[PDB]
């Protein structure tokens, strides 16, 4: 139950679906059409959560009907070990400023704030500006 495998650019559409499903305006479509650190969470053959990293947490999502079953945080641990094994101690992520609920509980893991809003980090799908927030951890 709640297993994790890789993407393998055969089922990249899986990942692109989970990123386009949960919080998708920002999620560009040329983004995942380059990649071929990726990892997806499976719930008895059901893809449920995804993770895209850069070396930074570039995306971490889980299906709303399979959250809170410890599943998103399992993807978080995979990112920490990845950092620990690339001889670096900096794991960071950019988040929208209106995203407060995916912060308080999401910052349960040591992830401290760099200091106020950044303004227009990235344009989404429409093309408008989107205030952003930066938090980071250490290995």
């Amino acid at each position: 139950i709640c297993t994790l495998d890789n993407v393998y650019a055969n089922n990249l559409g899986m990942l692109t679906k989970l990123a386009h499903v949960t919080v998708p305006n920002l999620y560009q479509d040329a983004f995942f059409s380059a990649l071929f650190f990726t990892q997806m969470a499976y719930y008895s053959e059901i893809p449920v959560g995804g993770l895209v990293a850069k070396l930074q947490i570039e995306f971490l999502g889980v299906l709303p009907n399979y959250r809170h079953k410890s599943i998103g945080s399992k993807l978080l641990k995979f990112a920490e070990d990845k950092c620990s094994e690339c001889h670096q101690h900096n794991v960071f992520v950019y988040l929208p400023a209106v995203d407060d609920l995916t912060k308080q509980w999401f910052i349960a893991h040591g992830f401290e704030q760099v200091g106020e809003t950044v303004n227009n980090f990235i344009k989404g799908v429409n093309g408008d500006e989107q205030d952003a927030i930066l938090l980071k951890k250490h290995i």
Binding site: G13, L18, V21, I46, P47, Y66
Partner: protein, 763 residues
């Protein structure tokens, strides 16, 4: 002259088919009476070019001109069996059998030849004679062949005993004598239980039917066969106890859990087992839950549709989409199919949407959503829903094919061809059309041919409705070509199917000798029956029936008369993407010569119909296709025949029958272009058995309104019968404008998919 002959052979063997046949055709003009080693060479050549009837004569002449090679008898036996000349093949078996008595295969061959010639006794004597000669000398390698030849000898005896209990006892004795040497225990047990049933010893048969079930409790056949042996065939109160007692021996197998659902008539109890078969499945989330219970929705919908609806709905009512997500999503998936089968499309979308937005990661949910959209008439949307599903996993070869199907059904042949090319072996080619023809992928070429026929009719109307009032002319020259291009490919892909099934008929050539040396005569006889049904299989008749629309039209349009070449780069480059066969084998890449034919009826006959008609049986014979074919070739005495045979079966109340009679009865007029002798015969035949059905006397009355007769005799609801008349409006004018409108008003009860296609193509 033997030099001009063997050259072709040597020539043929390398690959140059052209001069290979060109050489050989002089070597036969030369003689008119050749050397045996020359007749042998050409017999080997005619066999390779699949000229069996001529190969037999060059092989028969080789011996007639003095030959020593006694293998010509086996070579003649294989070839003669291929053309169905088993009277002459028995002669060849006897001759080769005499020449090599040491090989058991030649005994089995001689026997099989006798068996099919009706000489059932000579076959048994032949096999028995070898049995007695080889007593105590069957080695371990030969034990399989010995087991087959014994079961085969029991097959002949059993078919010769018919229902004679005196003899049926002796075939039972032989079966129990050979049993220690027979390894086909399943077939021996299957045979034994049939004799016990024919012998009336139903108690003994019930013991075998129970042994068979134990050897395979997933086989529905032995379960219900056991019922007849017990006599409880019509006792639901004793069938309930039977399967209940079988539910303990085999509690994982479905026959004990499913067969009760076909006879229980008490709602309370029937609903209990219904709950026991589909609820554990929805618990495990097995996607085929509805597909396993759908037969009940077709044979006894009225008493199983609503009781399953309550069971599943109540089940889902107490489901948590957090907590129990696997059973939650797969119960919505069931309920979506439950309502889709009931044509309750609003609820059908209602239950698939939840499962999808809850779990948009299982491709099954996409196929079902795309399946409902195709029922609604949104082919291009349904195709889009499926391309989303295949984006989830590009390795799934199953979703690709389902996706390729939906793109072909939406006439998107370009997306379809290239989605399919992701799994084909292209190599030194562009797409996968030539590879799909190599692997005999009939699922693709039929769907693509039907798509081309749809695209041809769509661009045809775009030609007529734009020709009705500069570039608005060279643009006509582009569409004038697209209509000829899609019509040819539609017909060139349809003609690719008989090429496959004649290969299936040539593929049994090697088995006339191989099955004998392998010692599988019983499985070989099943191959001869299989070869005599190849042109009746669903894929062959689907291509034939669909291609008849083109051939029949080409004859019907034949009725009333139907800075120059600097664009060939458009045609020459596009011919590289539609090529089906190697360039060294096909020059009519666009079927250009198929659509410009001057004998459309004889092309359809020698490419599809003749081989089908000769093999099809009355049970499954298409009589409407028979009528429509003989009508366009003159045989009116075969049109009433099909209509009479169609009548034997479907009641004189069918609206299709009435339309066929009206069209035929109208051909019995003096102004019609038919043979007056057949006209007189068909008139007599129409009076003899259908005088109390139609006002035959009023075919001469030019003021009789037959549409009004149809209306009052068959209603305005029989869509298919109205469409048949509308097909023959040029030969039988009865108010085409009034007929068209009445067809349109009868489309209200059909689903939007069937209405759209009737309006867009059938009218």
């Amino acid at each position: 002259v033997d030099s001009l002959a063997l050259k072709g052979l040597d020539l043929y063997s390398v690959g140059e088919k052209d001069d290979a046949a060109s050489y050989v055709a002089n070597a036969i003009r030369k003689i008119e009476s050749a050397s045996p080693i020359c007749c042998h060479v050409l017999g080997i050549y005619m066999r390779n070019t699949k000229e069996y009837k001529e190969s037999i004569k060059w092989f028969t002449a080789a011996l007639n001109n003095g030959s020593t090679n006694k293998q010509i008898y086996r070579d003649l036996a294989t070839l003669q069996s291929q053309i169905g000349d088993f009277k002459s093949a028995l002669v060849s078996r006897k001759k080769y059998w005499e020449a090599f008595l040491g090989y058991r295969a030649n005994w089995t061959s001689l026997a099989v030849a006798q068996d099919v010639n009706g000489e059932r006794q000579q076959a048994i004597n032949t096999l028995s004679q070898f049995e007695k000669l080889a007593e105590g000398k069957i080695s371990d390698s030969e034990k399989y062949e010995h087991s087959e030849c014994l079961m085969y000898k029991n097959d002949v005896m059993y078919k010769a005993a018919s229902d004679n209990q005196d003899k049926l006892q002796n075939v039972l004795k032989h079966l129990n004598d050979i049993e220690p040497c027979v390894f086909d225990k399943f077939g021996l047990l299957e045979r034994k239980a049939t004799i016990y049933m024919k012998l009336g010893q139903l108690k003994d048969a019930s013991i075998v039917y129970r042994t068979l079930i134990k050897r395979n409790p997933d086989n529905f056949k032995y379960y219900k066969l056991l019922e007849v042996s017990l006599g409880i065939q019509g006792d639901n109160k004793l069938k309930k106890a039977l399967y209940g007692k079988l539910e303990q021996f085999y509690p994982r197998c479905e026959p004990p859990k499913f067969i009760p659902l076909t006879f229980l008539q008490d709602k309370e109890e029937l609903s209990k087992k219904l709950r026991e078969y589909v609820l554990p499945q929805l618990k495990r989330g097995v996607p085929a839950t509805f597909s396993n219970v759908k037969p009940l929705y077709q044979r006894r919908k009225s008493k199983v549709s609503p009781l399953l609806e309550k069971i599943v709905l109540d089940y889902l009512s107490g489901l948590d989409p957090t907590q129990d997500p696997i059973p939650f999503i797969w119960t919505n998936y069931y309920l979506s199919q439950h309502f889709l089968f009931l044509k309750d499309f609003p609820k059908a979308q209602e239950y698939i949407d939840a499962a999808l937005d809850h779990t948009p990661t299982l491709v099954e949910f996409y196929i079902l959503k795309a399946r409902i959209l195709k029922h609604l008439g949104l082919m291009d949307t349904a195709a889009g829903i499926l391309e989303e599903g295949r984006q989830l996993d590009l390795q799934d070869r199953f979703i690709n094919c389902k996706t390729v199907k939906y793109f072909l059904r939406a006439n998107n042949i370009d997306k379809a061809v290239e989605v399919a090319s992701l799994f084909t072996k292209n190599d030194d080619s562009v797409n996968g059309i030539k590879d799909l023809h190599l692997v005999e992928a009939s699922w693709f070429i039929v769907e693509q041919a039907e798509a081309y026929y749809r695209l041809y009719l769509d661009r045809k109307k775009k030609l007529d409705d734009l020709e009705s009032l500069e570039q608005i002319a060279n643009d006509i020259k582009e569409n004038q070509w697209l209509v000829r291009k899609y019509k040819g490919l539609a017909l060139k892909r349809f003609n690719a199917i008989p090429k496959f099934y004649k290969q299936f008929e040539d593929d049994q050539l090697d088995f006339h000798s191989y099955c004998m040396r392998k010692g599988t005569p019983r499985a070989y006889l099943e191959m001869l029956e299989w070869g005599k049904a190849l042109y009746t299989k669903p894929m062959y008749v689907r291509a034939m029936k669909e291609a008849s629309k083109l051939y029949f039209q080409m004859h019907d349009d034949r009725l009333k008369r139907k800075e120059a070449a600097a664009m060939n780069k458009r045609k020459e480059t596009e011919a590289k993407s539609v090529a089906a066969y190697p360039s060294d084998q096909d020059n009519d890449v666009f079927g250009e010569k198929l659509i410009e034919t001057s004998t459309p009826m004889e092309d359809f006959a020698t490419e599809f119909y003749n081989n089908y008609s000769m093999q099809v049986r009355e049970d499954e014979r298409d009589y409407i296709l028979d009528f429509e074919f003989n009508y366009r070739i003159g045989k009116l005495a075969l049109c009433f025949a099909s209509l009479n045979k169609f009548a034997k079966r479907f009641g004189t109340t069918s609206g299709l029958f009435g339309s066929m009679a009206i069209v035929l009865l109208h051909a019995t007029r003096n102004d019609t272009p038919f043979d007056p002798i057949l006209k007189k015969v068909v008139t007599k035949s129409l009076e003899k058995e259908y005088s109390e059905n139609f006002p035959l006397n009023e075919i001469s009355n030019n003021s009789f309104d037959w549409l009004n007769f149809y209306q009052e005799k068959f209603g305005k609801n029989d869509i298919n019968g109205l469409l048949f008349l509308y097909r023959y409006r040029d030969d039988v004018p009865i108010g085409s404008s009034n007929l068209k409108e009445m067809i349109i008003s009868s489309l209200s009860p059909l689903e939007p998919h069937s209405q759209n296609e009737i309006l867009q193509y059938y009218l």
